[PDB]
Amino acid sequence: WLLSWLTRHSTRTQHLSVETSYLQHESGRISTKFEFIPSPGNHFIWYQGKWIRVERNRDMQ
Amino acid sequence: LAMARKGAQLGLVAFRRHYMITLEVPARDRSYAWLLSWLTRHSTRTQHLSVETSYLQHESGRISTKFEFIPSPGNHFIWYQGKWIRVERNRDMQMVDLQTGTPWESVTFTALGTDRKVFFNILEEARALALQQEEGKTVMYTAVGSEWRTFGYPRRRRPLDSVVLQQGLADRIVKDIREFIDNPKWYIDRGIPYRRGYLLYGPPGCGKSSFITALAGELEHSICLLSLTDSSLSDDRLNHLLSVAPQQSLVLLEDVDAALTFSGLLNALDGVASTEARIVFMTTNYIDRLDPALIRPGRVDLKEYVGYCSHWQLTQMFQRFYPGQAPSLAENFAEHVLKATSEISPAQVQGYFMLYKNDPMGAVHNIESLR
Amino acid sequence: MVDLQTGTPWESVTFTALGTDRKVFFNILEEARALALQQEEGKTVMYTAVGSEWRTFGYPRRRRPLDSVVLQQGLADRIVKDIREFIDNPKWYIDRGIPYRRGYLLYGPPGCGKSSFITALAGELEHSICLLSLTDSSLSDDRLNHLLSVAPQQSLVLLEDVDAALTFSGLLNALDGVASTEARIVFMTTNYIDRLDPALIRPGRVDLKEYVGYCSHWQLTQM
Amino acid sequence: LAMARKGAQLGLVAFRRHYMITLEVPARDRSYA
Numbered sequence: 302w303l304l305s306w307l308t309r310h311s312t313r314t315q316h317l318s319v320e321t322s323y324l325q326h327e328s329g330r331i332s333t334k335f336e337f338i339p340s341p342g343n344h345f346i347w348y349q350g351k352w353i354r355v356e357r358n359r360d361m362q
Numbered sequence: 363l364a365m366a367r368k369g370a371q372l373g374l375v376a377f378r379r380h381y382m383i384t385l386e387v388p389a390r391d392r393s394y395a396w397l398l399s400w401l402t403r404h405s406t407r408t409q410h411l412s413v414e415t416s417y418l419q420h421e422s423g424r425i426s427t428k429f430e431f432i433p434s435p436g437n438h439f440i441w442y443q444g445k446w447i448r449v450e451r452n453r454d455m456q457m458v459d460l461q462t463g464t465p466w467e468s469v470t471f472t473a474l475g476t477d478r479k480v481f482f483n484i485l486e487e488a489r490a491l492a493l494q495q496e497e498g499k500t501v502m503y504t505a506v507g508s509e510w511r512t513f514g515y516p517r518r519r520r521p522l523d524s525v526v527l528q529q530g531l532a533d534r535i536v537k538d539i540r541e542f543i544d545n546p547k548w549y550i551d552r553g554i555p556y557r558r559g560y561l562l563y564g565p566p567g568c569g570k571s572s573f574i575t576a577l578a579g580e581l582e583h584s585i586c587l588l589s590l591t592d593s594s595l596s597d598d599r600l601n602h603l604l605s606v607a608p609q610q611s612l613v614l615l616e617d618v619d620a621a622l623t624f625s626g627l628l629n630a631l632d633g634v635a636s637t638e639a640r641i642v643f644m645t646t647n648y649i650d651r652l653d654p655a656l657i658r659p660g661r662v663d664l665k666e667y668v669g670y671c672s673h674w675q676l677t678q679m680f681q682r683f684y685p686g687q688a689p690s691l692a693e694n695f696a697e698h699v700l701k702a703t704s705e706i707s708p709a710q711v712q713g714y715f716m717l718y719k720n721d722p723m724g725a726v727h728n729i730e731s732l733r
Numbered sequence: 734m735v736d737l738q739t740g741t742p743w744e745s746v747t748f749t750a751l752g753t754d755r756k757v758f759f760n761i762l763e764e765a766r767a768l769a770l771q772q773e774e775g776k777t778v779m780y781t782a783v784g785s786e787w788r789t790f791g792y793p794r795r796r797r798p799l800d801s802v803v804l805q806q807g808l809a810d811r812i813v814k815d816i817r818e819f820i821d822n823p824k825w826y827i828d829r830g831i832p833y834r835r836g837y838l839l840y841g842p843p844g845c846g847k848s849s850f851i852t853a854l855a856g857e858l859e860h861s862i863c864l865l866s867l868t869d870s871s872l873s874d875d876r877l878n879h880l881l882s883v884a885p886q887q888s889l890v891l892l893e894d895v896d897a898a899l900t901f902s903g904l905l906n907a908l909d910g911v912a913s914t915e916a917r918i919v920f921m922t923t924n925y926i927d928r929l930d931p932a933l934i935r936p937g938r939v940d941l942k943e944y945v946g947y948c949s950h951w952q953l954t955q956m
Numbered sequence: 957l958a959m960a961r962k963g964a965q966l967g968l969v970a971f972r973r974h975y976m977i978t979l980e981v982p983a984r985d986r987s988y989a
């Protein structure tokens with residue numbers, strides 16, 4: 302929910318990661334749609350208030 | 363102090379650069395194959411490559427081995443519409459436990475340009491490649507009691523050009539069925555059951571069951587074969603099986619003339635308490651046993667007769683079984699064939715060419731044996 | 734660490750060359766494949782129908798070479814050409830609406846090599862065999878239609894002593910069934926051709942009639 | 957300071973060699989045998 306809102310709200314973003322939907326229904330029918338979310342790192346977005354620092358970071362766990 | 367001040371400024375500059383740069387990272391999301399395959403085709407001149415081996419050991423003693431090459435761990439430089447792009451595939455100290463116990467893999471694409479219209483094309487190209495590589499197959503379903511299960515391997519799609527009927531006879535049915543799939547809102551909004559009826563009738567061996575087999579493969583739909591001569595089939599067995607049919611499928615009935623009763627067939631064909639997106643096809647070798655009121659709109663939305671071979675069917679079938687021949691040979695043949703036979707079904711034309719496979723001119727000189 | 738198989742270190746092998754041409758490694762991988770495949774030798778796996786299902790029958794037999802069954806000259810090559818033409822041309826059938834199936838009939842005196850040759854032919858083409866004798870007691874009309882409808886890919890169907898044929902009327906959909914799998918080759922063996930109907934051996938059901946006779950002068954020199 | 961200066965020049969030369977050097981790596985894809 303959060304990630305979808307981020308992409309919808311910004312509409313103008315640089316670092317993005319690709320998630321692929323492989324809805325291979327058992328009929329030979331393959332349905333593929335692309336859902337875009339921000340990539341590994343930090344982003345800045347504009348809201349009613351001042352610029353907000355958003356960060357998505359990976360760990361060793 | 364001096365080093366710390368220099369380091370902080372550098373990092374800030376990189377972030378500003380990142381805004382005017384571009385980064386994409388996919389991690390084991392089944393995008394690797396599509397992206398990587400496009401990369402090798404696009405570069406054509408590459409140094410560091412890794413080998414993935416395909417071991418398609420079909421159970422027949424047959425071992426099939428092919429090598430698929432992809433770039434190795436590290437970085438590469440490619441030339442595109444924009445300025446030179448730095449592509450890197452890098453390994454990490456983290457580990458995946460899901461599939462095979464292998465290192466986590468990250469692929470990063472960094473470009474000089476500030477326009478993001480480029481990658482939309484790149485991803486789509488990979489989808490085109492992956493679907494071009496794979497070939498569609500029609501999945502067949504067989505009723506095992508009250509449920510459906512896959513039957514053998516996915517069969518290869520018989521092309522629609524093989525079943526050769528009169529001109530405009532195949533195109534009129536295609537228009538009706540393509541309209542049904544592309545308009546799901548017109549039905550439910552108006553409370554109409556989202557179902558479409560079709561009937562093909564005629565003498566045996568005309569192509570009633572032949573055409574329906576090839577139509578589903580073109581539309582990327584499955585088929586539910588059902589002969590009305592089974593011994594373990596009853597009335598209650600059939601009502602359930604037609605309600606749990608896979609989506610994007612066509613229901614086929616063979617030799618409806620032997621109807622099971624006629625009065626009990628009403629609620630079976632058009633049941634209000636039934637699923638949506640159901641397409642039914644009906645084939646009967648003898649129309650002289652069905653009631654004319656059975657084929658009205660609501661149950662059958664298009665009546666069409668499938669007759670013997672016409673001149674249009676003979677000229678085209680002669681070119682399928684004997685390609686590369688002169689057009690005049692596909693006129694002397696169709697001329698004398700109809701002159702020696704009053705009525706001839708395609709099943710007899712399909713079997714006659716089996717005596718002279720890939721042997722033109724023999725069919726014109728040996729028409730009298732068909733008496 | 735690998736947790737999949739055995740708890741071993743993950744292993745990577747690197748080949749590094751100074752030269753700028755990539756023609757070298759293409760040869761290296763190919764030679765390695767040849768070495769491993771030369772060592773192993775293929776075996777023909779035999780399958781037997783136990784009622785309505787299929788089960789393995791004994792161990793994989795050692796492939797009897799095709800030169801062991803010694804028939805007249807040109808008889809082994811004509812059958813190889815006909816069946817290799819069928820396997821290597823799957824597009825010629827479906828495009829023309831013909832069922833992708835091939836019929837074969839072998840007739841002659843008993844003990845001439847009809848069933849012997851079929852054992853060696855599948856080994857040459859690296860195909861399996863589905864043994865089926867026409868003397869079973871639990872076999873009926875519907876029982877045979879099911880077994881013939883799920884054939885393994887790259888396999889040959891064998892029939893023993895077709896002369897003693899289960900009913901004849903129910904055999905029509907069994908021989909040429911529209912609802913059957915693709916890439917299916919059927920073989921028929923009868924020790925007496927004087928019991929089959931002439932309309933039973935037409936194209937569509939039987940695509941090649943072949944007689945197996947006694948030893949000629951050429952066969953004695955080779956044996 | 958000294959260490960940082962030396963590393964930058966050396967590392968770049970290797971990258972130039974990477975284009976002029978071919979590499980093949982298989983990883984436990986049943987090609988090891």
Ligand SMILES: Nc1ncnc2c1ncn2[C@@H]1O[C@H](COP(=O)(O)OP(=O)(O)O)[C@@H](O)[C@H]1O
Pocket residue numbers: 524525526527565566567568569570571572573645647708709712829830831832911
């Ligand atoms: N109109 C046609 N064009 C090409 N082939 C046909 C046609 N009609 C029938 N055939 C061939 O006849 C065979 C069986 O036809 P079938 O579907 O059993 O006829 P029906 O279902 O009308 O009794 C198939 O192998 C098919 O290729």
Ligand SMILES: Nc1ncnc2c1ncn2[C@@H]1O[C@H](COP(=O)(O)OP(=O)(O)O)[C@@H](O)[C@H]1O
Pocket residue numbers: 801802803804842843844845846847848849850922924
């Ligand atoms: N043409 C042949 N060449 C070599 N051996 C043969 C030949 N024909 C038959 N045999 C031998 O005969 C035995 C049984 O033959 P079989 O396959 O039962 O004959 P059929 O099946 O024609 O009745 C086998 O041991 C086989 O080695």
Ligand SMILES: [Mg+2]
Pocket residue numbers: 566567570571616617645647
């Ligand atoms: Mg029919």
Ligand SMILES: [Mg+2]
Pocket residue numbers: 843844847848893894922924
């Ligand atoms: Mg015998």
